[PDB]
Amino acid sequence: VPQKPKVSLNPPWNRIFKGENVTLTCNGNNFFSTKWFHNGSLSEETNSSLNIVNAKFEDSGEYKCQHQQVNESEPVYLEVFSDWLLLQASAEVVMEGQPLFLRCHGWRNWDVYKVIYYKDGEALKYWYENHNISITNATVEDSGTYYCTGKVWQLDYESEPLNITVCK
């Protein structure tokens, strides 16, 4: 009885804007029939990878993938947004000691400057930043709510806060 399958998204963002694409893939079970469940309803998709093109809020929700008589995977919650700024996260629940990366993602990959992430109101400093993202080794301290800010065109926006937990 091979252990249970696992879903991975490419990109890793489980929070995406309306109109973006994301691919879901069911994990490695053997070297060597797929069944996708969207919000718990068997999908007409049977291939190993589920492609979500031009995301629609309707695509938000839970997802599971299962091989025949091998118990289903752990649920993955996707969520489509519509806003100027969106704080994307590698994962919302991180196992202490693992990597945590964030991303102040602008709509249509718009140029955002003066970016600044914050953990519980306070700015986070010294994360490995790169216009693309910021990373850090997970700590039980890193737990808390996040949200970034940045200037677009000439204005300063702020994203919807986000709740991240580092299970010690």
Ligand X SMILES: *[C@@H]1O[C@H](CO)[C@@H](O[C@@H]2O[C@H](CO)[C@@H](O[C@@H]3O[C@H](CO[C@H]4O[C@H](CO)[C@@H](O)[C@H](O)[C@@H]4O)[C@@H](O)[C@H](O[C@H]4O[C@H](CO)[C@@H](O)[C@H](O)[C@@H]4O)[C@@H]3O)[C@H](O)[C@H]2NC(C)=O)[C@H](O)[C@H]1NC(C)=O
Ligand Y SMILES: *[C@@H]1O[C@H](CO)[C@@H](O[C@@H]2O[C@H](CO)[C@@H](O)[C@H](O)[C@H]2NC(C)=O)[C@H](O)[C@H]1NC(C)=O
Ligand Z SMILES: *[C@@H]1O[C@H](CO[C@@H]2O[C@@H](C)[C@@H](O)[C@@H](O)[C@@H]2O)[C@@H](O[C@@H]2O[C@H](CO)[C@@H](O)[C@H](O)[C@H]2NC(C)=O)[C@H](O)[C@H]1NC(C)=O
Which residues contact ligand X by CB under 6 A? 39, 57-58, 60-61, 79, 82-83
Q: Which does 137 bind (CB under 5 to 8 A by kind): ligand X, ligand Y, ligand Z, none?
A: ligand Z
- Determine if residue 54 is left, alpha or beta; phi over 0 gives left, psi from -120 to 50 gives alpha, anything else beta: left
Q: Which does 19 bind (CB under 5 to 8 A by kind): ligand X, ligand Z, ligand Y, none?
A: ligand Y
Does residue number 145 form part of the binding site for ligand Y (CB under 6 A)?
Answer: yes
Residues whose CB falls within 8 Å of the CB of residue 54, separated by 6 or more in sequence, listed in order: 19, 20, 21
CB of residue 57 vs ligand X: minimum separation in angstroms? 4
Residues whose CB falls within 8 Å of the CB of residue 153, separated by 6 or more in sequence, listed in order: none
Please state, in angstroms and rounded to a whole number, the distance separating the CA atoms of residues 25 and 65: 8
Does residue number 47 form part of the binding site for ligand Y (CB under 6 A)?
Answer: no
CB of residue 53 vs ligand Y: minimum separation in angstroms? 4
Please state, in angstroms and rounded to a whole number, the distance separating the CA atoms of residues 79 and 18: 9
Residues forming contacts to ligand Y in the complex (CB under 6 A) are: 19-21, 53, 145, 163
